[PDB]
Design goal:
homodimer, alpha/beta, Serine Threonine Protein Phosphatase 5, Tetratricopeptide repeat, Rossmann fold, seven-stranded parallel β-sheet, 12 strands, 58% helix, gibberellin signaling pathway (chain B), protein O-acetylglucosaminyltransferase activity (chain B), differentiation (chain B), Glycosyltr_41/O-GlcNAc_trsf (chain B)
């Protein structure tokens, strides 16, 4: 009785007696081989046995039982599925794929076969077809979770692949589809975020990153990116918070280490910045930007030599690093006195390389008429409350706008009342302001060409955010540099340079690539600020001793200056020095500086280190706290000396062999105080002691300084303007020939 | 020189040395008030509160007059929490010196603190006056103005609040809280522009002040909703995203983005944003509702049910979710649960018209025709232009309207007039009025799949002289299948011009049909579901014909002719219709047998020893009036068994109701086998082995069911009546040659049924020979039917040309 045997086999299977069920089905099929139900039940029992053996570790017995089942019933899709699974466990990926294909040909509702084939194929990287397999799976069953998750993963991988080839839009589309299949997928959100960041969306980049972090609190990359976006929005506190979270998750994420170091540098917390950057170097030796940031941190912190060394390693890692090279040259300007031709050669080599990777123009449509109206463009990122602004203000106001059309290219990152006032003055005379912050160098060159300027004046040189890349294009028929840098730009593309006969004597030995154009009178036209207040009386009259001071930065105070100041203060009993500068907000810097002076035998008590109290009026009045300003070398001050003079504190400087050194000589002699210019360190000491010995002469000098200078040419805007215009006309006439 | 040197030394961050000098001065200079003051200040700055208090007390004892000493005493009192004492010292100092500034500002501070204390005590007027006194001693003190603004705001003096916060903002521009509160007040007045501006100022001062960010996000979301309501959806989305910038987890902004993208048809993004909105605000039931709608429209019914169950778990009386869940259950066939859902939706909201429409359709499927009709009339009371409600209402009335008056015709006429007054039409055609050139025949219908209409339209589709009547098919089929594709091949292999028109519009379709130069437009659908009567409302074709899609008048004056025969619609029929009836010589239907019908088998009664009646008609046709007649039949015939097969029986509720009805009518359920809808065509066809005699329904006769019965050799008993739908069976049976099986009344019907039941043997023989008899009859005479239909086309076209 085939029916009774089949029912017995089914009952045995229901009781878990798979062997007895198989035996009963075999007997039934021996009695009637056409009894389809008996064959089906036997195949079922054989598949159950095979699955038990597979899970029991009897892989070979499982395979054998599956082959027997598939020989008994070909149409039994589950046997094909189990065979494919076993072959996958056997790493027979092609055999597994074939088994799943057969199973899908047999079972029309076996979506798991599509899922597993898609997974296996994904493991070999043929993403698109596997995705098609998942599409078939979800077309059969649209709620199968595991398949949705694999669909999202595969779509994210494909979107990343396609984006890396440059089709950002298709990558974004794949990420959005992935989020359609799995909304809480951190990788999709993160990738989408970076994609938006690339296409300058910012807003949604931030939103996406925050969501990605919310759904996966282990994506330090998301935190770091978010911190970067907030930093670029000037929300420094949020940026710090984000980076701190990133480091709390990954205490070695080198990129976040550098970024946090930079933000601390902006806030001026120098010791923490140093520690973070050093940790970044410890974590990454190839991360050039870490070396550049370390070099800037050393530069402002005064450890100059170490700054040059750090930039040198940076250029060993990335020889094209623009920032590393320019900061290196700027730092060298602080200590390389005129002796050798190493700074000059460095400038020449750097300019030649910059010209090699940056081609320039070769023709100009400027009508070569020596007498027609000349268009002068002044370019600078420093038309804000910055040292340079204290001088360029003079030409902005005292210039003829009838034949010298002035156009200003202000790259100021943050305007202010002074920015607005400057634009107002320039435009009121007929100027065409042009805000260029963020604009690509090449586009700036094109814009300059379109406006058809004649004399292009670069005002920053190798300082932060410089625009020498625009100058390399040679957009204007004549390019000059003036105030932003006291040495050669090194660019052969600049035609001439403006100077005076005192900063650069006709016999100067400092080699430079540029031809010096010496103005008749002084080349510095300091515009006194109206917030200077009254000339405070000589402190010596009320205190009873001379107080030296120096309102310069740390980069300019080379150890040699420290030796000279220690000699001065030891040689003059009862005399105090009150240096003031921004980095003295850090206690560690104060301690190190005090110890450094102590090794020179000077009692720290006499010194009065002060931070950069951000108070314009109070900054001006602070010269009421000192009696004699002592200039630094080999990088003498320019605005600082002007401030000293205008507040009645006499400044003593030293002459030297390079423009950067002799700027103070030029200024002091041209203000008619050349008798306070020492020629050497010994004469410097003698002058300092002599000035310190006569408090009454000091009082007379202070009370005379404001009116003498106000009547002196340094403040005679009209005459300086006439000289400058004549110089411009002369260079233009030379060019016409 | 000593006092000057001490003061300079104290100013030069040399507090220890200055303190030592002050000590040696109070020692040497026993009554040196200035030295006592210097010592007090240097110790206070050294956090020597006790010593500072001692020095200040000694200074006051020596000089009770100098304003500086009293100022230092007052500040120390404030640091010690002696607000009162500080205040008295301050008044004394003011009386001593009115020019001192530090005392003035610190005095403003202490009095504003006092005013705040009194305000907290409820002494609002005393606080206000104290603040005014402070501002009189120092107008520049912004915090006093801020306090005034707060008190006036809580005091509902909003204009005064603005004035106060503006005086504060002038006196202190970096006072973020003033901007925040100003923005909040403007938010309260409905104006969101200036409010956003105030929040922008606040964030321009302090971007980390989160409270202003949240309030800004709220304001931007409201602004986005407003702008969207104005029409500009892109700007709305822009505002929503800018909002979601300030509060990345603001769930409501995500929900509104979901809505905005849904309107844009970017459904995938809509899903993402609705799911996120729900994730951040579980209480946002509306997000679940709309998510369920989107998933339902993607045919993912299980997820739609899940989403609606969540919406109802949040708001059980959320009418929209109740209605949509009811519809989803309707598609799945959970008829009783659907009924309960829709009824609860109505109970929660009585004006939700579409719920009334869905209730009416559900009851019509359940056979309660009266209640379905009633629900449709209620719907039309709530919404009178509900096109679907009207369509279902007329269709439902066709199931129980026994021809006894002209009210149905009146309703159809008025409804068609409504359509003609809410639709325009053309008046000229360039089609050459010629009776010899090949005419263009359009068949338009959504039923070109496994539907009743197909089983009849297939025959002409197979037999159309293509050299004369160029066939154009306008298919509104929604879901195709193997049969649909097979039909496509059949139409496209004989030179037909197929045109898929599903899912676009009515007006544009009519215009395209006119471009197609269709000569006669034929509707095959009637007032059923997915009809396209709106196209004909435009009158796109010069000739309009309705073949079977509707068994009664369409009521549209725009339809010229309705195809019928002289038996279903006798020439003397009294039912008026707007259309002209065209009677074909033979039965107006040509049944195309299924190529899967298979063979016939031995009569069941022969093997079981008892006669089995049956009805495969849907429950909608089995009105409560036929049930009594059927009970009479089964009682009159000893040992008979009734098999009824209708879809809605899958639900136990309807089954039980039907059984109860039969039991109260005098019949034991044990004789009644109720079978639900079977799965595949084959088994449905084979189910005819379960019945011996088909019993036709009235006043709506079967059409496909009757044809199938005659095919498979199961005789059907029908009766003639006053309406076409009743006489369809009469026409069919007469034209097959079984006119002796046509009853004229209920009693003749009973007698005929008994007569057929009395002779099992002859019944079996007839059953055997019926397939060949009918196959030889005109109902299967494709050539003759085609020729007659061609003649009909020629006659109508010639009539039109003249």
């Amino acid at each position: 009785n085939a029916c009774a045997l089949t029912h017995c086999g089914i009952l045995h299977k229901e009781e878990g007696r798979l062997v007895e069920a198989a035996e009963s089905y075999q007997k039934a099929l021996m009695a009637d081989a056409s009894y389809k139900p008996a064959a089906e039940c036997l195949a079922i029992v054989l598949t159950d046995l095979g699955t038990s053996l597979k899970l029991a570790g009897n892989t070979q017995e499982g395979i054998q039982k599956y082959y027997e089942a598939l020989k008994i019933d070909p149409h039994y899709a589950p046997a094909y599925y189990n065979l494919g699974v076993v072959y996958s466990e056997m790493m027979q990926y092609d055999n597994a794929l074939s088994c799943y294909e057969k199973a899908a040909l047999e079972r029309p509702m076996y979506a798991e076969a599509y899922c597993n084939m898609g997974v296996i194929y994904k493991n070999r990287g043929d993403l698109e077809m596997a995705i098609t397999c998942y599409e078939r799976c979800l077309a059969v069953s649209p709620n199968f979770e595991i398949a949705k998750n694999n669909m999202a993963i595969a779509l994210t991988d494909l979107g990343t692949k396609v984006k890396l080839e440059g089709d950002v839009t298709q990558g974004v589309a794949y990420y959005k589809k992935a989020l359609y299949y799995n909304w809480h997928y951190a990788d999709a959100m993160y990738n989408l975020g970076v994609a938006y960041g690339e296409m300058l969306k910012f807003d949604m980049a931030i939103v996406f990153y925050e969501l990605a972090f919310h759904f996966n609190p282990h994506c330090a990359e998301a935190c770091n990116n978010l911190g970067v976006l907030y930093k670029d929005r000037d929300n420094l506190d949020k940026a710090v918070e984000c980076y701190q979270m990133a480091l709390s998750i990954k205490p070695n994420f080198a990129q976040s280490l550098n970024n946090l170091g930079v933000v601390y540098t902006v806030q001026g917390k120098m010791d923490a910045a140093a520690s973070m950057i050093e940790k970044a170097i410890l974590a990454n030796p190839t991360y050039a930007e870490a070396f550049n940031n370390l070099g800037v941190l050393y530069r402002d912190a005064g450890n100059i030599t170490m700054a040059i060394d750090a930039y040198e390693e940076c250029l060993k890692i990335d020889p094209d690093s623009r920032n590393a090279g320019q900061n290196r040259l700027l730092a060298m300007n602080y200590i390389n006195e005129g002796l050798d031709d190493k700074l000059f050669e460095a400038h020449r080599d750097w300019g030649w390389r910059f010209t090699r990777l940056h081609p320039q123009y070769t023709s100009w449509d400027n009508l070569k008429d020596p007498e027609r109206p000349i268009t002068i463009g002044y370019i600078s990122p420093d038309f804000f409350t910055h040292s340079v602004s204290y001088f360029i203000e003079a030409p902005l106001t005292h210039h003829d706008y009838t034949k010298y059309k002035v156009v200003v290219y202000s790259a100021v990152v943050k305007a202010d009342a002074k920015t607005y006032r400057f634009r107002d003055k320039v435009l009121k005379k007929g100027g065409v302001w042009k805000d260029i912050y963020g604009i690509d160098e090449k586009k700036i060159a094109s814009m300059v060409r379109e406006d058809k300027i004649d004399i292009l004046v670069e005002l920053t040189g190798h300082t932060a955010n410089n625009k020498l890349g625009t100058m390399a294009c040679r957009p204007a028929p004549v390019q000059v540099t003036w105030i932003g840098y006291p040495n050669t730009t090194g660019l052969p593309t600049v035609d001439y340079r403006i100077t005076d006969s005192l900063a650069d004597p006709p016999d100067t030995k400092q080699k430079q690539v540029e031809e010096l154009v010496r103005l008749p009178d002084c080349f510095l036209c300091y515009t006194p600020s109206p917030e200077a207040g009254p000339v405070c009386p000589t402190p010596a009259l009320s205190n009873g001793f001379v107080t030296f001071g120096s309102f310069n930065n740390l980069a300019k105070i080379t150890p040699k200056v420290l030796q000279v100041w220690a000699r001065i203060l030891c040689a003059v009993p009862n005399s105090r020095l009150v240096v003031k500068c921004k980095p003295f907000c850090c206690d560690s810097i104060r301690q190190r500086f005090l110890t450094t002076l102590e090794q020179l035998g000077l009692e720290s008590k006499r010194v009065d280190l002060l931070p950069l109290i951000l108070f314009n009026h109070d900054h001006m009045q602070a010269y009421s706290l000192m009696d004699i300003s002592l200039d630094t070398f080999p990088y003498a001050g320019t605005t600082t000396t002007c401030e000293s003079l205008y507040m009645g504190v006499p400044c003593v400087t030293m002459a030297g062999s390079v423009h950067a050194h002799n700027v103070g000589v030029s200024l002091l002699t041209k203000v008619g105080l050349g008798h306070l210019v020492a020629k050497n360190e010994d004469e410097y000491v003698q002058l300092s002691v002599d000035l310190a010995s006569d408090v009454t002469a000091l009082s007379k000098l202070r009370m005379s300084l404001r009116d003498l200078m106000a009547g002196s040419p340094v403040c005679n805007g009209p005459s300086f303007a006439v000289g400058l215009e004549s110089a411009y006309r002369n260079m233009w006439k030379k060019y016409c020939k």
